[PDB]
Each structure stands twice: as structure tokens, then as C-alpha cells.
Amino acid sequence: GPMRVFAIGNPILDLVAEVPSSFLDEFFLKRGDATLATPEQMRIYSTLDQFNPTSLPGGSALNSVRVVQKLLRKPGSAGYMGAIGDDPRGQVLKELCDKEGLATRFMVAPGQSTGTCAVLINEKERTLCTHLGACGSFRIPENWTTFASGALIFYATAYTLTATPKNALEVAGYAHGIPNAIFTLNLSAPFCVELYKDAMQSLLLHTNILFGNEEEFAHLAKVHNLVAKVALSVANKEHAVEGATKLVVMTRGHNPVIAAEQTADGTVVVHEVGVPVVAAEKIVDTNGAGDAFVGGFLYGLSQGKTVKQCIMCGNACAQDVIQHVGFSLSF
Ligand SMILES: Nc1ncnc2c1ncn2[C@@H]1O[C@H](COP(=O)(O)OP(=O)(O)CP(=O)(O)O)[C@@H](O)[C@H]1O
Ligand SMILES: Nc1ncnc2c1ncn2[C@@H]1O[C@H](CO)[C@@H](O)[C@H]1O
Ligand SMILES: [Cl-]
Ligand SMILES: [Mg+2]
């Protein structure tokens, strides 16, 4: 069918810049972390101009769906909903989605600005500091099911919980009642795991595929029981548990990707797939690596490939993205 994957997310503009460690210190940021800007960090946005930053579209789920749309090519192959502000920045994101052929229904929040994320590159790592702005007012429209009619893969990032957990809950609810449809979720960042524990619990029950990195699962283990790689991964599959797709995919930088699935009979299958080596000197920045991996994974899943094949496609998409500035598109 036309629409193959439908997602909700926070559309944001990324401002990328290479900054010295001193900048991280002055802004109270932890290298490699992802957080929402506190009042004191608001000054980071204007101050970046001294570093000649570059700007490009961002937003975790948007980045992912853009990979699926690029690989599927047909207009409306991927659908997306989110909220943008009534400003020139919002217009740039919108124009870009239209030119890429994605199907979108953006909600415009008058009086508010389009979200922005400062992507600070230092050493090799990326640190993210975001100001949601209009993204926080996002509410799914009553007829979203009509816009996404035909889609069998629904995706949401935990980052959408900040606006309200109702959005993702409604999407999962809908998918659940549809046979042959699956709901997929990304843990997004440690902060989401720690702040939205309750909503996540209800959400996990209705999740078919859970994606996240080692750091996110670690917090998920602690916040929940299991505690403890492989064990953490097998651990998380209970949260989704208690043939219906139940799979957990854990990414971890250059280390092998670990996927654990629970088959119909209760058999647990775990795959440990290596990630092709990429010389460090060839890496530009790792911003968007996980989003690219999820996008390649969902596109392959859309084509009926196997779990291992899914993972290989995700790895290939991520390897391309890490060789570019911010979230690029190529292949
Ligand atoms: N050093 C590296 N060498 C090769 N591949 C790497 C890599 N770092 C990341 N990847 C690729 O990226 C995938 C995801 O890595 P990871 O989840 O750790 O990214 P992330 O958490 O940086 C990205 P974002 O900026 O979206 O938040 C891995 O499964 C792998 O395919
Ligand atoms: N709170 C957030 N919600 C959604 N996307 C985000 C958030 N913070 C950072 N991102 C995005 O994560 C991407 C890297 O995975 C960047 O392109 C950035 O725009
Ligand atoms: Cl998002
Ligand atoms: Mg990384």
C-alpha cells in the first residue's frame, strides 16, 4: 500500500557546530548526553554564531521516516505528524518534507517557535541540547487514522512523551487493534526513560519492536527490575511480554548489535550481529546514527526481510550518516 510507515515526532531544526570543551563546561553539558535546555542554557542558541554553525533539519523520528521515504521513493510512502511554530524556520522544515515526497500533516502552533537543537560536536562525540518550542503543543488530530490508512508500521519516539504521552498511547492503541500492524518505539534518551516511567510501562505492553542504545536500556533495567548486553536485552523483552511480534533491538556504537525476540512458543532467539568497521578518521559526527539505523531497519522490515537482514540495512544506513555532517541523506 501507499503509506507503509506512519510516525509522530518533534520536528526540529539542528544547529551544528564544533566547539571546544570549555563551551560544554560553561553550558553545564555532559559530553555525549541529550537533554532539554534549562533557563541558563537558553543563551546557547545565540552564542553559537561565534562558531560559524551550519543548520539542517533534525528531529529523531523525522530523520528516521525520511530514510524510509527516500528508500521507498513513491510519494506518501512514509507519513508524519508533529507541530511546528508559525515561523520561517517551520516553513523550511515543511518545504523540505514536501520536496522529499513525505506525506505530512503539520500542526502549526501560532505564537510559538519551531523547536531547535544545538548539536555540539567535540572530540568525536555529539552532545544535544534542545528547546522544544511548538513541539510541546502537538495533539494528534481526530482523523489521524484516515491520513495513515493503509500503514502497517507505526513508530513513535519516547521524545514525544514530553508534549504528552497521550499521542503515543493513541497510536499504540490503534495499531494494537489492527491485525498485521505493529507498533514500534524508540527509548530516545536516558532522560525519557527516567521521567516517563509510568507512561512507558503502559506503552511497552502494546509495543512490538523496541529500539534503544545500551545506555537507554541500562536505565530501563534500573528503572524497572531486570537490571544486570544480552541479559539487559533479554530482560527488556519481559516488559513487552507479560505469533505476535515481540522483539528488542539494542544498538551500541561500534559494538555488535543485539536483538532478542520471543517467538510464539515462548522460544527466545537472540542475534549478535557485527557492525562493519569504520576508521575513526573517516567519521565526521555520529549525530543521527541511531535514527538512520532505525530508518534502514523499518524500511527493510517493510520489505519483509529477516531480523538479521533488518539489522544489516540499519547498519549500512548508519555508517553512511556517520560519514556526514549532522543527519544527511545519500546511500
Ligand atoms: N563508531 C562506529 N563505527 C561504526 N558504526 C557505528 C559507530 N557508531 C555508531 N555506529 C552505527 O550506528 C548505529 C547506532 O549507534 P548508536 O545507537 O550508538 O548511535 P547514536 O546513539 O549516536 C545517534 P543520534 O545522534 O541519533 O542520537 C550502530 O548500530 C552502528 O551501525
Ligand atoms: N527532544 C528531542 N526530540 C526529538 N528529536 C530530538 C530531540 N533532541 C534531539 N533530537 C534530535 O535527535 C537527532 C539525533 O538523533 C538530532 O537530529 C536532533 O534534532
Ligand atoms: Cl522525535
Ligand atoms: Mg553515539
CATH 3.40.1190.20 residue ranges of the chain are 1-11+57-114+132-329
Q: Is the CB of residue 287 below 6 angstroms from any atom belonging to ligand 1? A: yes
* Whether 271 contacts 259, CB under 8 Å: yes
Ligand 1 pocket, mutate which of 286, 312, 328 (most atoms under 8 A from CB) = 286
Q: Is the CB of residue 239 below 6 angstroms from any atom belonging to ligand 1? A: no
Question: Residue 135: what are its φ and ψ, rounded to 5°?
Answer: -55, -30
Task: List, in sequence order, every residue forming a beta bridge with 154; answer none if it has no partner.
Answer: 6, 183
Distance CA 174, CA 142 (A): 12
* Whether 188 contacts 158, CB under 8 Å: yes
Ramachandran assignment for 205, one of left (phi > 0), alpha (psi -120 to 50 degrees), beta (any other)? alpha
* Whether 7 contacts 64, CB under 8 Å: yes
* Whether 3 contacts 79, CB under 8 Å: yes
Nearest to 128 by CA among 251, 44, 22: 44
* Whether 277 contacts 291, CB under 8 Å: no
Nearest to 82 by CA among 37, 117, 133, 128: 133
What CATH class is the domain 12-56+115-131?
alpha beta
Distance CA 24, CA 205 (A): 38
| Distances, alpha carbon 153 to alpha carbons 111, 187, 226, 298, in Å | 33, 17, 28, 8
CA atoms within 13 A of residue 276's CA, in its CB half-sphere: 12
* Whether 222 contacts 240, CB under 8 Å: no
Q: Is the CB of residue 10 below 6 angstroms from any atom belonging to ligand 2? A: yes
Distance CA 102, CA 192 (A): 27
Ligand 1 pocket, mutate which of 321, 322, 325, 327 (most atoms under 8 A from CB) = 322
83: its cell numbers: 507541530
Give, using CA atoms, the residue closest to atom 14 of ligand 1.
Answer: 290
CA atoms within 13 A of residue 75's CA, in its CB half-sphere: 3
135: its cell numbers: 513541539
Atom of ligand 1 nearest to the CA of 293: 13
Active site residue 25: no
CATH 3.30.1110.10 residue ranges of the chain are 12-56+115-131
Q: Is the CB of residue 318 below 6 angstroms from any atom belonging to ligand 1? A: yes
For the domain 1-11+57-114+132-329, what is the CATH superfamily, name and number? Answer: Ribokinase (3.40.1190.20)
Q: Is the CB of residue 90 below 6 angstroms from any atom belonging to ligand 2? A: no
Q: Between β-strands 268-273 and 255-262, what pairing exists: parallel, antiparallel or unpaired?
A: antiparallel
* Centroid of ligand 3 to alpha carbon of 156 (angstroms): 7
Pairs from 98-102 (Cβ < 8 Å, separation ≥ 24): 100/66, 100/69, 100/70, 101/69, 101/73, 101/74, 101/75, 101/76, 101/77, 102/65, 102/66, 102/69, 102/76, 102/77, 102/78
Atom of ligand 1 nearest to the CA of 280: 1
Distance CA 292, CA 62 (A): 10
SS3 sequence of the chain: CCCCEEEECCCEEEEEEECCHHHHHHCCCCCCCEEECCHHHHHHHHHHHHHCCEEEEECHHHHHHHHHHHHHCCCCCEEEEEEEECCHHHHHHHHHHHHHCCEEEEEEECCCCCEEEEEEEECCEEEEEEECHHHHHCCCCCCHHHHCCCCCEEEEEHHHHHCCHHHHHHHHHHHHCCCCCEEEEECCCHHHHHHCHHHHHHHHHCCCEEEEEHHHHHHHHHHCCCCCCHHHHHHHHHHHHCCCCCEEEEEECCEEEEEEEECCCCCEEEEEECCCCCCHHHCCCCCCHHHHHHHHHHHHHHCCCCHHHHHHHHHHHHHHHCCCCCCCCCC
Distance CA 185, CA 61 (A): 10
Distance CA 166, CA 79 (A): 19
| Distances, alpha carbon 8 to alpha carbons 100, 110, 154, in Å | 17, 20, 9
Distance CA 246, CA 234 (A): 11
Longest dimension (CA), the chain: 59
* Whether 117 contacts 126, CB under 8 Å: no
- For 207, counting Cβ atoms within 10 Å of its Cβ (0-12 exposed, 13-18 middle, 19+ buried), the class is buried
* Whether 61 contacts 294, CB under 8 Å: no
Return binding residues: 175, 178, 181
